[PDB]
Design a protein around this ligand. Sequence first.
Ligand SMILES: O=P(O)(O)OC[C@H]1O[C@@H](O)[C@H](O)[C@@H](O)[C@@H]1O
Length: 288
Amino acid sequence: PIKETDKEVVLTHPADETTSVHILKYGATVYSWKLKSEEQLWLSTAAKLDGSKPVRGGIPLVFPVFGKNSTDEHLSKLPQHGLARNSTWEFLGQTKENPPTVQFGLKPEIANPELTKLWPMDYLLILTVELGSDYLKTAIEVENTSSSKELKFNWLFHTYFRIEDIEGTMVSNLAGMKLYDQLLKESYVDKHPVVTFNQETDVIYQNVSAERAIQIVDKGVQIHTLKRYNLPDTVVWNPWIEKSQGMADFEPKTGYQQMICIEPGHVHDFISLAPGKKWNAYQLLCKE
Ligand SMILES: O=P(O)(O)OC[C@H]1O[C@@H](O)[C@H](O)[C@@H](O)[C@@H]1O
């Protein structure tokens, strides 16, 4: 079933109503995904769900710029990670009962007014969210609705996976890939056979295809699998102690121990869309 309220849309799977996903209209932000009652995503207990600022947790949507830009006249005006996660999207309706599937839309006319004035480019976004019995698929389509101007953008899903304990966690299938380390400010190949975590981590992997599933492992158990289409980059991030402490909307302060962000995106360069052209991609979360 699919239920709409003033602030959100909630999907429950017909075969098992304890499998569910909650999507805030603000940012079209998935903030909970339960699989047979078990929460899959990390959400700060102090996250704002009231539209006052981006949600600290779940799956914030990053568009049209990942990070902070300092090279483009207009993109450099936007705050870190763009304006999609700061704007209230329109609920376009349900498209299927089983698996429950819904769509959300964004265009400048309904987006964050302040930020739209800073980056007055035309676009149409449609997010499709499909709740399977054992997966969550979040798909995006971007259309350049301008008749004359090229549309230049990044897209990323800022996925906060819930885990039991970060220091026991490893991430597989990234061995041998090139990354840019945003902390050390250098690029290098990951020569570790798995990724482990004992400090702040903020890295951007390049060249991951639809064929490479990334797995999150704890106690020899594969607790999450991330698949994607058309998102060649993967950001891996954990704020660790100090940064967690400095984020007012991040609670509990030990909460970095129960999350890892593994964020599929197109962020290494900008996508350029000619007038009337479209681009699409998705992230697919599951368990193998
Ligand atoms: O705090 P935000 O804007 O949600 O971004 C989360 C993190 O995003 C990363 O891309 C940045 O490198 C970090 O510095 C930042 O803390």
